[PDB]
């Protein structure tokens, strides 16, 4: 058990948008063509780093198996990111990109923990890097995963 025929089809369709000449490989050049379509014009050096990070057999191009592997890991990654984003948005009651002491205390109460200002301030101090007395998304993630 790993993937359905439909999943593999969608993986192939995506690979094809990179493999411009259908040779079964994505090169630095082909990756460049796609990115240039998306508004980025990376250097050959930048493209080669992008390939080297995922070309497992060090053969210089990415094959469909190599793509499946990097895709599956990116998707799981994005699942985790999304959970963190949705949580940050539960806490950032006003959406200004920062969890304040008042916001955190409000959400904690509803989460079942009726906290004092001193307690919530200590929580924030633990996570606060830029010293602004608020928890911004990076600070939230860094604490939640470490
Ligand atoms: Ca190709
Ligand atoms: Ca660049
Ligand atoms: Ca390869
Ligand atoms: Ca806020
Ligand atoms: Ca902060």
UniProtKB/Swiss-Prot annotation:
Keyword Repeat on entry: yes
Outcome of mutating residue 100 to F: In CAM1 (also named PNTA1); lacks the Ca(2+)-dependent K(+) current
The protein's name: Calmodulin
Transmembrane segments: none
Residue numbers binding Ca(2+) 1: 19, 21, 23, 25, 30
Binding site for Ca(2+) 2: 55, 57, 59, 61, 66
PTM summary: The pantophobiac mutant CAM2 is undermethylated on Lys-114.
Positions where N6,N6,N6-trimethyllysine occurs in the chain: 114
A GO MF term: enzyme regulator activity
Biological role stated in the UniProt entry: Calmodulin mediates the control of a large number of enzymes, ion channels and other proteins by Ca(2+). Among the enzymes to be stimulated by the calmodulin-Ca(2+) complex are a number of protein kinases and phosphatases.
């Amino acid at each position: 058990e790993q993937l359905t025929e439909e999943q593999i089809a969608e993986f192939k369709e995506a690979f094809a948008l990179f493999d411009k000449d259908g040779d079964g490989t994505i090169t630095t050049k082909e990756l460049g063509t796609v990115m240039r379509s998306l508004g980025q014009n990376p250097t050959e050096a930048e493209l080669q780093d992008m390939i080297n990070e995922v070309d497992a057999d060090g053969n210089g191009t990415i094959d469909f198996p190599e793509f499946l592997s990097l895709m599956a890991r990116k998707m799981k990654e994005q699942d985790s990111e999304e959970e963190l984003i949705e949580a940050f948005k539960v806490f950032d009651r006003d959406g200004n990109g920062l969890i304040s002491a008042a916001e955190l205390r409000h959400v904690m109460t509803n989460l079942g923990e009726k906290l004092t200002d001193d307690e919530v301030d200590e929580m924030i101090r633990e996570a606060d890097i830029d010293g602004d007395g608020h928890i911004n998304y990076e600070e939230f993630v860094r604490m939640m995963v470490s």
